[PDB]
């Protein structure tokens, strides 16, 4: 009949793929995913808000602050709290840093998943400096919680923005050298141009989000249409793709890195010295000096860490432009100290839904290039 290959969990991420292929050029591929299933939604249902914030930190794991930002803005949207301006600007700066990190890992792991070895090492030296910044800010290497609902917790120490300025200059030169290395590299252009075309009608019906909508025509940015924070005050532009190519989508990711450099530059130049957290002791914990020499601050610290703050009853769905796309969180909260049911819209899940139309008329090396060309981490796809 036809060859029903079973690509197991070995490395060409981690999945299982059963492809009923015709003859080096396929027929019917089915991704069996769910191998990395953990039980995040049931665990958040049996825990509180502040305690189950790290589940939202690590359900996606390459992006590490946009997922925190999405859950914290879900809770701050439901709880009716505007965060202070310096918290909003630090949240914007770290959103752009995490965006730069996720796009550069997607570029390098797509290059290594094809087989090119060296810009992986170059840009991972750059991402080692990124993790040095995360270490100095929070204390963690990767999984900095750091974003409480109620603003940024424990603001950045003195002597950081100069290092971010130096990193901005050197990283602009390094991404220019990446475009020098690849990108009009002839064999790589031969590797990926005409594979995985996506009609914009199918991009809307199959529910593609983020970079796929940029590549397949239609102009759609959450940062431009629905400013959920101080993005309306920083000036940037989004790149759009003419043809539905993979090469086009690569160019779009590189130019989103470059626009992240612009937003980091303006955010450094326009920092207000407002405050760390909100002006409400019943949501954010009070600082430790007032805790020690104050009665009400000790009472609010004690109850706010045992019971937690309550949330008024209601349901909300917010979604922010994570580097993979519209990362969505839908909270349903009975009026209590625990959420009733949370659910996560994953752009990687929505992109992996259309794998049939992205790999109908191509070969299997192009199937590996299609799996690589969408920033799919297989921990977020699981929910």
């Amino acid at each position: 009949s036809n060859l029903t290959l079973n690509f197991g969990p070995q490395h060409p991420g981690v999945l299982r793929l059963v492809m009923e292929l015709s003859g080096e050029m396929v027929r019917k591929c089915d991704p069996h995913i769910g191998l990395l299933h953990r039980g995040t939604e049931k665990l958040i249902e049996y825990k509180t808000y502040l305690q189950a914030l790290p589940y939202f930190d690590r359900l996606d794991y390459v992006s590490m602050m946009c997922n925190e930002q999405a859950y914290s803005l879900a809770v701050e949207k439901l709880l009716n709290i505007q965060p202070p301006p310096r918290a909003q600007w630090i949240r914007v700066l770290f959103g752009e840093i995490t965006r730069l990190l996720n796009h550069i890992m997607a570029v390098t792991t797509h290059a290594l998943d094809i087989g090119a070895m060296t810009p992986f090492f170059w840009m991972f030296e750059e991402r080692e400096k990124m993790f040095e910044f995360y270490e100095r800010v929070s204390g963690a290497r990767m999984h900095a919680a750091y974003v409480r609902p109620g603003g940024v917790h424990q603001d950045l120490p003195l002597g950081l923005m100069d290092d971010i300025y130096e990193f901005s200059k050197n990283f602009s030169l390094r991404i220019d050298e990446l475009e020098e290395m690849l990108t009009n590299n002839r064999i790589w252009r031969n590797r990926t141009v005409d594979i995985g075309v996506v009609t914009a009608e199918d991009a809307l019906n199959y529910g593609f989000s983020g970079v796929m909508l940029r590549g397949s025509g239609i102009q759609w940015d959450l940062r431009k249409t629905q400013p959920y924070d101080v993005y309306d005050q920083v000036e940037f532009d989004v790149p759009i793709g003419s043809r539905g190519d993979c090469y086009d989508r690569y160019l779009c990711r590189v130019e989103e890195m470059r626009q992240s450099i612009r937003i980091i530059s303006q955010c450094l130049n326009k920092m207000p010295p407002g405050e760390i957290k909100v002006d409400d002791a019943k949501v954010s914990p009070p600082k430790r000096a007032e805790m020690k020499t104050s009665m009400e601050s000790l009472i609010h610290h004690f109850k706010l860490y045992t019971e937690g703050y309550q949330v008024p009853p209601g349901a909300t769905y917010t979604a922010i432009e994570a580097p993979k796309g519209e990362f969505g969180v839908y909270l349903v909260s009975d009026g209590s100290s625990r959420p009733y049911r949370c659910k996560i819209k994953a752009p990687g899940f929505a992109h992996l839904a259309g794998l049939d139309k992205m790999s109908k008329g191509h070969m299997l090396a192009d199937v590996v290039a299609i799996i690589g060309t969408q920033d799919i981490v297989f921990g977020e796809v699981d929910r």
Binding site: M161, S168, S172, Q259, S265, L268, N269, P273
Partner: peptide
């Protein structure tokens, strides 16, 4: 007083343009 971290009068420019020599 206050001892936050603001920039010192504004930082310099950071380039954001694709640079190629086309040699």
């Amino acid at each position: 007083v206050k001892q936050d971290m603001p920039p010192v009068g504004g930082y310099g420019p950071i380039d954001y343009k694709r640079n190629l020599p086309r040699r």
